[PDB]
Structure formats: C-alpha cells, structure tokens
Amino acid sequence: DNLMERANSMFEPIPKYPPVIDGNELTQAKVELGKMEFFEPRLSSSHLISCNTCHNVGLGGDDELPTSIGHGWQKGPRNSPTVFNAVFNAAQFWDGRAKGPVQAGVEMSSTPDRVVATLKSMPEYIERFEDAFPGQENPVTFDNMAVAIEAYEATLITPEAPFDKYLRGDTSALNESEKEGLALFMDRGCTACHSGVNLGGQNYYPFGLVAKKGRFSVTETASDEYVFRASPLRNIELTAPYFHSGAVWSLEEAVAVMGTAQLGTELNNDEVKSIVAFLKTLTGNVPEVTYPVLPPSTANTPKPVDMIP
Numbered sequence: 606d607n608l609m610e611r612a613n614s615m616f617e618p619i620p621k622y623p624p625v626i627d628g629n630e631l632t633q634a635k636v637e638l639g640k641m642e643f644f645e646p647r648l649s650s651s652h653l654i655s656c657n658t659c660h661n662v663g664l665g666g667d668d669e670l671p672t673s674i675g676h677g678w679q680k681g682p683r684n685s686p687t688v689f690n691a692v693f694n695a696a697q698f699w700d701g702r703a704k705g706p707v708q709a710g711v712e713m714s715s716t717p718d719r720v721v722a723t724l725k726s727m728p729e730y731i732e733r734f735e736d737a738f739p740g741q742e743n744p745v746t747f748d749n750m751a752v753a754i755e756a757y758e759a760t761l762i763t764p765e766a767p768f769d770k771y772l773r774g775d776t777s778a779l780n781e782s783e784k785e786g787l788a789l790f791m792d793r794g795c796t797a798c799h800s801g802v803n804l805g806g807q808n809y810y811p812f813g814l815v816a817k818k819g820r821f822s823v824t825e826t827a828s829d830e831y832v833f834r835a836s837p838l839r840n841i842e843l844t845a846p847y848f849h850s851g852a853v854w855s856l857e858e859a860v861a862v863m864g865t866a867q868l869g870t871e872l873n874n875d876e877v878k879s880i881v882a883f884l885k886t887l888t889g890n891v892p893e894v895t896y897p898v899l900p901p902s903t904a905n906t907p908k909p910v911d912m913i914p
C-alpha cells in the first residue's frame with residue numbers, strides 16, 4: 606500500500622502507553638497527585654474552577670464553549686483546546702507570542718503563593734508531595750505542582766483510533782470513503798501545516814479565522830506577522846466548536862473554510878465530506894478516569910473568594 610507508507614511518512618500513531626515527556630517520570634505517587642490536582646477547584650481563588658472545568662474529560666478534554674471563561678465569569682478570548690494528547694504538541698498556545706499551559710491555567714484565577722499556601726494547609730497534600738518528590742525538604746512548590754499535573758496529562762492520551770490501527774498496518778482500519786479523505790488530506794496541502802503525531806500542534810502559521818453558513822474564512826495575516834498554531838486535528842470530531850475563537854460549530858464548515866483555491870488547498874463539496882470522514886477516524890480511546898477524593902480544608906486553608914464580589 607502506497608497510501609499507507611505515505612501516511613506513515615507524514616504521521617505517527619499515538620503511543621499505546623503514557624510517555625515520559627521531558628524526563629517527567631510516571632511514578633504512581635506523582636500521577637495520583639497530578640490527578641487530584643487536575644480536579645482540584647481550590648487551585649482557583651473562588652474554589653470553583655479546576656483544570657477539568659475547562660478541559661472536561663467527559664467532554665473531549667475541553668469545555669465545548671466558543672471561548673473559556675476569562676476574568677470574573679466573563680467571556681475569555683480563546684477556545685480551550687483539548688488536553689488529550691497535548692503533551693505531544695511543541696506549539697502550546699493559539700497565538701505566537703515563557704509560561705506553560707499549566708501555569709497559565711492556574712494563574713487565570715489565582716496566584717502561585719496562594720496555591721502553595723492552599724496545598725500546604727492540607728496534610729494529605731503534603732504527604733503526597735513528599736511521596737511524589739522524595740528527598741526534597743520543601744516538596745510543595747508551584748513547580749512541583751506543575752510537574753505532577755504534567756505527569757497526569759501524560760496519561761491523558763487517546764490511543765487506538767482507527768487511523769492509528771491503519772498506520773500500524775491494518776489496511777482495513779479505514780473504509781473506502783475514508784481513504785479518499787486521507788488521500789485528499791495529503792494531496793491538497795493540509796499536511797504542510799497539520800502533520801506528525803497529532804496532525805498539527807507543532808507550528809504557527811500566518812493564517813487565522815476572520816469574519817468574512819459562510820460567515821468566516823481563514824485568511825493570511827498582514828505581512829505574515831501574527832501567527833496562529835495549526836491545530837492538532839486528532840479527536841477533532843470531539844472538540845467543537847472550532848478555530849481560536851470557537852466561532853464555527855460544524856466540522857464540515859471548518860474543513861470548508863480551510864480548503865480554498867486561495868490557500869493552495871481547493872476542495873469541492875464532496876471533497877470536504879471525504880476529509881470529514883477521514884478526520885472522524887482520528888478519534889481514539891478516551892482514557893478511563895476515576896474521580897479523585899480531595900482532602901477537606903483546614904483552619905489554615907485560604908478562604909474562597911467570591912467571583913462577583
């Protein structure tokens with residue numbers, strides 16, 4: 606199969622087991638702590654927002670809103686991307702600009718000092734930090750908190766999508782209609798920006814969605830100065846709405862506004878549908894999640910702050 610070897614030169618399948626990213630070892634104590642952290646709403650000053658609020662594991666790893674809640678409980682500027690397979694993305698933000706997603710996420714509703722004070726006020730967290738970061742005198746630090754969360758994110762991968770079975774050899778994993786969408790995807794230029802393990806998530810490009818249904822289009826930015834990350838398309842079927850602003854709900858419309866003659870990627874209606882069929886084959890196994898049990902607050906725990914004072 607030439608189609609198959611072509612696909613294997615452009616893409617890679619999601620690893621079957623959680624990866625060690627940047628030397629972040631997956632010990633049980635660290636992954637368990639990270640899981641607690643991920644669902645811990647007390648990392649926010651209101652005690653109501655956790656990573657799971659915006660990267661909902663039951664909703665595709667994101668929040669299914671055009672844009673996430675920003676300051677107060679007002680509309681934020683960006684669509685929250687899925688946390689599923691995110692550890693494989695070299696480009697982590699929508700806009701080309703040194704904080705990482707974890708830090709940016711927490712700071713959206715709180716401060717490092719307050720987060721640390723919160724975690725040290727609960728005996729169980731101190732014990733877990735001590736067990737997850739053995740031999741450190743002050744294990745509960747904002748950096749270690751991030752390392753633990755990151756270790757947990759490494760387990761939030763979605764292996765075994767039909768397409769990955771195909772890449773691994775099962776010529777039958779994709780049907781006729783899906784092989785066309787795949788051929789189109791590799792023939793009409795999509796792979797110039799959306800390739801690798803997540804079919805995207807690696808580079809910024811000078812193209813963004815703008816108001817032009819057919820109310821939007823992706824157009825080159827002035828002088829190519831501002832750039833947007835070409836989104837990782839893996840699990841795209843489950844991460845609507847689309848684009849940096851979440852302005853497009855239809856996956857079909859999303860593919861349409863990216864496949865124009867004026868991009869070097871022209872697609873007619875049927876060709877759009879074929880790509881959509883191929884994109885659906887990118888949905889992998891949602892990782893199983895056992896809800897953690899968080900420890901109760903103590904007298905030293907900073908009190909919740911009202912969102913709307």
Ligand code: HEC
Pocket residue numbers: 643654655656657658659660673674675681683684685686687688691692694696697698699700706707708709710711713754758806
């Ligand atoms: C909503 C109020 C959020 C909370 C709470 C957290 N995150 Fe988030 N995250 C949010 C948005 C809107 C974005 C995109 C920001 C942009 O301008 O680009 C993100 C992004 C991430 C990513 C990057 C995705 C990637 O493809 O690499 C990750 C991995 C991530 N967020 C993780 C994360 C964690 C673990 C959080 C709790 C500590 C967390 N976020 C909170 C919105 C929100």
Ligand code: HEC
Pocket residue numbers: 790793794795796797798799809810812813814823833834835836837838841844846847848849850859860863864870872880
């Ligand atoms: C670089 C010049 C690109 C090429 C060629 C293609 N895409 Fe793309 N795509 C690119 C960027 C920079 C973005 C983000 C734009 C923004 O304003 O947010 C995207 C986005 C998409 C999406 C939405 C993804 C999401 O919301 O998670 C889809 C469905 C998509 N792109 C599809 C797609 C197809 C099918 C392409 C070939 C016809 C294609 N893109 C080419 C950059 C680039």
Ligand SMILES: [Ca+2]
Pocket residue numbers: 667684685686844845846847848851
């Ligand atoms: Ca989305």
